[PDB]
Write a sequence for this structure.
């Protein structure tokens, strides 16, 4: 999971 | 927004759609290319091809279970492109590049046409 | 194999599937959650959820146009997860994380359950 | 396009  | 994103989600979705295709699950159309028949999901075809997008947004053609392609279309070129639609992987070879480019132009798959033009220019 | 790969293909496919959902094109099921109704593509639901995968591979349920979820399922939690299925983006917030995790466990969306467990453990 |  990432900060888009 | 303040959303988080799962990097592999789109790839995992496409992998599962290909698993459904391989097991013939919820396929709703057969694409006829000369004597050859290819089963697929209308939504995936539309998502990958400007031609299928136009066909299945048509109020009459959206309901067809069989689509016949132009007789000039090569079944191997179509098969390679159908595999690309469901995997992101293109089996581009010296012996098939002309048939693949011609099929991609007909199917309106802009990114495939672009890589075929570049690979032909190099040789 | 000797294939080449188009990095953005899976993301572009998912973006187009979401465009079809937003225009209600080729949607083939309505998911009923309490009073709320959500239209979707069975194939995308199966590709994202272990629960929908089991439902639509069932020889009888595969033909249903309406699926009613357990009354304990929260419509907002479902909406956030349906958006995630079609975008890879999860709108996870303090006020919705418990409903999102409970809905993801019911829908069998393992990666979402994992990030909810981690975000809850941190607080 | 890349070599996967
Ligand atoms: C253009 N548009 C709004 C849109 N919405 C939904 C879908 Cl499924 C769609 N697909 C499509 C249309 C044109 C093209 C492609 C997909 C690939 C391409 O090279 N051209 N295009
Ligand atoms: C497991 N399998 C062969 C498979 N093939 C096709 C599809 Cl559409 C599919 N989808 C699915 C099944 C289980 C789970 C998911 C999707 C997401 C998840 O967390 N669990 N799973
Ligand atoms: Cl393309
Ligand atoms: Cl997930």
């Amino acid at each position: 999971w990432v900060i888009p | 927004d303040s959303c988080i994103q799962f990097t592999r989600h789109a790839s995992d979705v496409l992998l599962n759609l290909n698993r459904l295709r391989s097991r013939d699950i919820l396929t709703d159309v057969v694409i006829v290319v000369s004597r050859e028949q290819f089963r697929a999901h209308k939504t995936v075809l539309m998502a990958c091809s400007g031609l299928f997008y136009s066909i299945f947004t048509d109020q009459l053609k959206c309901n067809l279970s069989v689509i016949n392609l132009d007789p000039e279309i090569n079944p191997e070129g179509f098969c390679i492109l159908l595999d690309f639609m469901y995997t992101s992987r293109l089996n581009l070879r010296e012996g098939n590049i002309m048939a693949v480019m011609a099929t991609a132009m007909y199917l309106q798959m802009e990114h495939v046409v672009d890589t075929c033009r570049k690979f032909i220019k190099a040789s």
In short: Residues 1-123 of chain C form a domain with the Potassium Channel Kv1.1; Chain A fold (CATH 3.30.710.10). Chain C touches chain B through 40 residues (CB under 8 Å).
